[PDB]
Amino acid sequence: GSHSMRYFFTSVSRPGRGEPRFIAVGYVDDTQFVRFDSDAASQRMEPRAPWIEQEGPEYWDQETRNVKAQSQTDRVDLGTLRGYYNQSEAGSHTIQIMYGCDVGSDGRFLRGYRQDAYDGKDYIALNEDLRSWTAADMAAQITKRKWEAAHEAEQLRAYLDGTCVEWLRRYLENGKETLQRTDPPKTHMTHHPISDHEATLRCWALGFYPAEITLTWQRDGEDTLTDTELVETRPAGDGTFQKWAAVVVPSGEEQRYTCHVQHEGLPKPLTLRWELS
């Protein structure tokens, strides 16, 4: 199947409390493999997946200073964007950056992306074609003009369809044992009377990987969005994920509601029904 590499960065100004907190995290698919935390004792890019630990001290020496550079850029940008938005020097603000690339089963480039946010809102993003930028508002258009000047899009394209796609392809082999696996969802339903005449049907999916999944409830074959409680997909903490969906039903009609589970490791869509005798 398809694979991805992604880096997430967060920079949080702490006015009068020293430099901004800086936390970086790298993933392959839904598996974390590196991290950097400005407040952590190490002050180095640390490994976080077994198969990346073999990388030599040159790898960790590079990554440490590069990820620190990105941190210093976010340190200036916090001040610049403060000006663009005419904000005081007393408030805490947040820059967030996400970038990476996607490949197919054969290791060929599919997609590159970069997106930036300020205080949790869209700021500027690189377009799908990797040539042009979309700024979210008029302040971010100032940056878009700076970056169109200095041809950042072309230097960045270098990484997103070049360096990125090659190192993804290495990692995917250094860790071929753990990363190529797909675990399909163990499924089952539960039933909880809320009273004498209504009950909660809860459709569970556990132990799956990757985290993408779909749960849907059908009443006589029709999709009920009524009384449908869906939780966020969550990590088991072992590399797998969990999700559930629930619908409140009239007691004695449990047979007419059916739950549907779609996942990549599933040869056909699972269909589950509460089976009263």
């Binding site: 970086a24 964007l81 990484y159």
Partner: peptide
Amino acid sequence: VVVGAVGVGK
């Protein structure tokens, strides 16, 4: 690997 080329600011 992260980006190597240090960017220009915002």
